[PDB]
Amino acid sequence: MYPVDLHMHTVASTHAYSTLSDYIAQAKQKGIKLFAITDHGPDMEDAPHHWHFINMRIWPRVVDGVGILRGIEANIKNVDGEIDCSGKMFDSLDLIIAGFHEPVFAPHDKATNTQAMIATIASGNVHIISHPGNPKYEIDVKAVAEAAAKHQVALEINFLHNCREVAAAVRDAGGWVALGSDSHTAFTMGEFEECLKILDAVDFPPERILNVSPRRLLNFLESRGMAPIAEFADL
Amino acid sequence: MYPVDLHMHTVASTHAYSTLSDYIAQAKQKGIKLFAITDHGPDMEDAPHHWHFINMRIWPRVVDGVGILRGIEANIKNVDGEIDCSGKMFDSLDLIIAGFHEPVFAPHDKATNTQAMIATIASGNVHIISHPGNPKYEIDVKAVAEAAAKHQVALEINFLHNCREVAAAVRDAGGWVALGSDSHTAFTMGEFEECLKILDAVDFPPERILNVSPRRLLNFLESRGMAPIAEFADL
Amino acid sequence: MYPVDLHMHTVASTHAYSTLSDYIAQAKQKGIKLFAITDHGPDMEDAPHHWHFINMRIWPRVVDGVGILRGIEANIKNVDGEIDCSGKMFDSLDLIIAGFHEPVFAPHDKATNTQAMIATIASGNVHIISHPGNPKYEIDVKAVAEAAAKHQVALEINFLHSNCREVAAAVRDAGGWVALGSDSHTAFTMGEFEECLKILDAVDFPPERILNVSPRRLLNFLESRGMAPIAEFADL
Ligand SMILES: [Zn+2]
Ligand SMILES: [Zn+2]
Ligand SMILES: [Zn+2]
Ligand SMILES: [Zn+2]
Ligand SMILES: [Zn+2]
Ligand SMILES: [Zn+2]
Ligand SMILES: [Zn+2]
Ligand SMILES: [Zn+2]
Ligand SMILES: [Zn+2]
Structure with a gap:
């Protein structure tokens, strides 16, 4: 089940291994x-140089039968929904x-956090919002899910850095959910058991989980304007 | 012999590989x-961010049958025996x-070095003093061995950064020795055949070498205040 | 063919993996x-600490039958041909x-780039000039290739960082060495020099002046430049 994991970190941060x-x-x-x-995008502490992301265009697509997407976990910078990913970085990357x-x-007032997150969602630049359920950052969950559904952005169900409320908001807003391990070692790769249970409880519809198959996720990225990746044709 | 190695470095420093x-x-x-x-502790050049240590809490305990301890090689900061390890770092680590x-x-006058080392030993915060037999830092030795025994701190017998003196001296002072490769690649892991023969030179008592077994070393840490690690129970 | 690759990068730069x-x-x-x-040498952005190079002296020489050279891709710093490699770094390294x-x-006037590159060559401190064919740095290729032959420096035949026929033909006539290098930033492209090879043959480049044909040829070149012989490689 869920042979796709979309969120993890390398030795490019020393807090990953x-x-x-x-x-x-x-x-x-x-x-x-x-x-x-x-x-982690380059404006964060302990994050790689922006060339880390630009030079990912060199990676092999398929290794040992495993498909490899070039991604970033960019940082929301302001209430205008800007992130620390440049044009050149976008050009090299598959997944934002x-x-x-x-x-x-820094976490601020509920309205501030909400506005920045919705402005990021509305920018058309991002495919997934990471750990929106983090209590550190209070948000209007419903208003965020509705924007994410309108702009076709997935909300993650997801340490150093609200399961039911997000899952149920996405359920009702009609959006996508993305499962992500936030792995900082490869040992937790693909492990997202903690929420699967809640998703079943809230009757979250299996059809709107991106991680169900490589093709469902790749189709989603293509619906967002990504040119098909020919090397992944047999996934 | 000696299925335990306690001192090695990863690519978190660029001078390790x-x-x-x-x-x-x-x-x-x-x-x-x-x-x-x-x-290496975070105050040192070419050393990782402090989060590198805090986030070690996520590591698996046992992989392929091998147990894994989360440690730091802290740097002695000042004559008060301070080290570049915060409380949050402590909380994440097993071995100091x-x-x-x-x-x-910077190495200073003998007295400066000693006030410093014997004071690190006396802080109760430290388990092992690494390469105390290093000529670049002169210290009162017989005396350091006597504080190490008093405070239950092991002295290492041990590039970029006297064996007999330490070995004979720890022998007579009654303290522990810890063997450590100070590996900067995995190729030298477990290799301390160099000082070892100087140990059989001073007829060092077999029972005061921590590395003889995982359990011996783990009981030492527990005696120093570490809660037992459940996953190592069968080691 | 070409069981030697001389130019590649590790996670010591975050733009390598x-x-x-x-x-x-x-x-x-x-x-x-x-x-x-x-x-990448330490003056560059996203490059390691200088100790990354000094401490390479601890590396094993041969792992699973493969020989491992300790190198640097140093950065030319100025028109005086200085590079960001210290005495203590040189002492730890085999290949410069x-x-x-x-x-x-920064890329500047053709004469600036040329003067800087030739001075580096003429320093005697370097074995290979990397991607001299880079269109971003205009040079007098013939003057460079002639300096390289004089001072026994190899020119590389060769995204982030990022004339192939013009370099090879200049080296051919000047009578110098060429070195092949993948400039890999992952190990997946290690040993991969397909691109320039056809053009080397197109210009009748003499295979006997390609360093990479065998380990012994490359090692003999380094020894010729003053490197004490590496015992552990005696059978390569
Ligand atoms: Zn992180
Ligand atoms: Zn995050
Ligand atoms: Zn993350
Ligand atoms: Zn070190
Ligand atoms: Zn040390
Ligand atoms: Zn060390
Ligand atoms: Zn590079
Ligand atoms: Zn280069
Ligand atoms: Zn390079």
Whole structure:
């Protein structure tokens, strides 16, 4: 179940401990068929240089049968919904996640957090919002889910950095959910058991979970304007 | 012999070249049953962010049968025996090694060094003093061995950064020795054949070498205040 | 063919993604018998600390039958041909590559770039000039190739960082060496020099002046430049 994991971090931050090759190896063993590396965007503390993201265009697409997406976990910078990902960085990347992390955007009033998150969602630049359920950052969950559904952004169901409320808001707003391990070692790759239970409780519809198959996720990215990746044709 | 290595460094410093996964693979190959990663403390040049240590809490305890300890090689900060390890770092770690490294504590007058080391030993915060037999830092030795025995701190017998003196001296003072490779690649993991023969030179008592077994070392840590690690119970 | 690759980068830069062990494993799989790690010199952005280079002296020489050279891709710093490699770094390293990279030396007038590159060559401190064919740094290719032959420096035949026929033909006539280098930033492209090869043959480049044909040829070149012989490689 869910042979896709979309959110993890490499030694590019010292607070992560696994490399691209560790992740490929763990994917192969666990039967994960498609994954994305999404290192923290460069404005954060302990994050890689922006070249880290631009040079991901060099990576192989398929290794040991495992498909590899080039991603970022960009940081929401302001209430205008700007993130620390440049045009050149976008050009090299397949997957844009964005979230709140305190060095870049300190938690503020509910209206502030909400406006920034919705402005990021409305920018058309991001595919997934990471850990929107984080109690550190209070938000209007319903207003966020409705914007995410309108602009076709997935909300993550997801340490160093509200399961039911988000899952139920997405359920009713009609949006996508993305499962992500936020792995900082390859050992938790693809492990998102903690929420699966809640999703079943709130009767979240299986059809709106991106992680169900490589093709469902790739189709979603293509619906968002991504050119088809020919190497993933047999996934 | 000595299936425990307690002092090694990962790519969290650019002057080291191996990852957690490299150390695991090597441990498996060399029959090492328990090991600790002890990356340089954050005040040192070319050392990781403090989050590198806090986030070690996420690591698996046992991989491929090998136990994994979360450590630091802290740098002695000042004559008050302070080290560059915060309380939040402590909370995340099992093993606290500390030692003199030039960028942080420029070697000074004997008395400065000693006030400093014997005071680190006396802080109760430290488990092992790394390469105390290093000529770049002169210290009252017989005396350091006597404080180490008094305070239950092991002295390492041990590039970029006297064996007999320490070995004979710890022998007579009644304290513990800890063997540590100070590996900066996984290739030298578990290799301390150099000082060892100087140990059989002073007829060092077999029962005061921590590395003889995982349980011996783990009981030592527990005696120093560490809660028992449930996953190592069968080690 | 070309069981030697001399130019590649590890996670010591975040714009690279592979470790020493990843390169070892790939060399074995690809039949590479000798390779060098040549991380970006410390003056560049996103480059390691200088200790990254000094401490390479601890590396094993041969792992699983593959020989490992300790290198640097140093940055040309100025028109005096200085590079960001210290005496203590030189003492730890086997192989010295140097090249232009934006943050350290900005592309300037053809004569500036030329003077800087030739002075580096003429320093005697360098074995190989990396991607001299880079269109971002206009040079007098003939004057460079002639300096390189005089001072026994190899020119590389060669995204982020990022004339191939013009370099090879200049080296051909000047009578110098060429070195092949993948400039890998993951181990997946290790030993991969397909692109320029057809053009080397197109210009009748003499194969006897390609360093990479065998480990011994490359090692003999380094010894010729003053490197004490590496005992552990005696059988390569
Ligand atoms: Zn993180
Ligand atoms: Zn995050
Ligand atoms: Zn994350
Ligand atoms: Zn070190
Ligand atoms: Zn040390
Ligand atoms: Zn150390
Ligand atoms: Zn590079
Ligand atoms: Zn270069
Ligand atoms: Zn390079």
